Ligand binder design. Structure first.
Ligand SMILES: C[C@H](CC(=O)O)OP(=O)(O)O
Length: 106
């Protein structure tokens, strides 16, 4: 189960640059947060998705930036409470790439 920016496996993906600006988002990610691409692209993630600040996701991204290592966690979703998700964050070519998978039926 090793989805990445190229082989997304139908999962929601977002990529952030070194200023944590949203430089890539797919449709599944947009539907999850219930936003349009124009609202998020090029914006600093904490500005347009402020619910992520101080959350597990904040810690997850910080750990990737501080160690370079991939991080994965299983948590209740911020944007869809009651949905159990597995969230992965990793560096891929200078970008910080995040994806999530609904694991509610597991
Ligand atoms: C925080 C979110 C997953 C969640 O709903 O907890 O991930 P994205 O910011 O949409 O990549």
């Amino acid at each position: 189960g090793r989805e990445n920016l190229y082989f997304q496996g139908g999962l929601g993906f977002m990529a952030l640059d070194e200023d944590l600006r949203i430089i890539y988002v797919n449709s599944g990610c947009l539907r999850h947060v219930r936003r349009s691409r124009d609202e998020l692209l090029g914006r600093v993630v904490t500005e347009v998705l402020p619910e992520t600040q101080g959350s597990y996701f904040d810690a997850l991204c910080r750990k990737v930036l501080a160690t370079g290592r991939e991080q994965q966690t299983r948590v209740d979703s911020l944007y869809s409470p009651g949905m159990t998700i597995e969230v992965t964050a990793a560096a891929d070519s200078g970008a910080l790439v995040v994806h999530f998978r609904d694991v509610t039926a597991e």
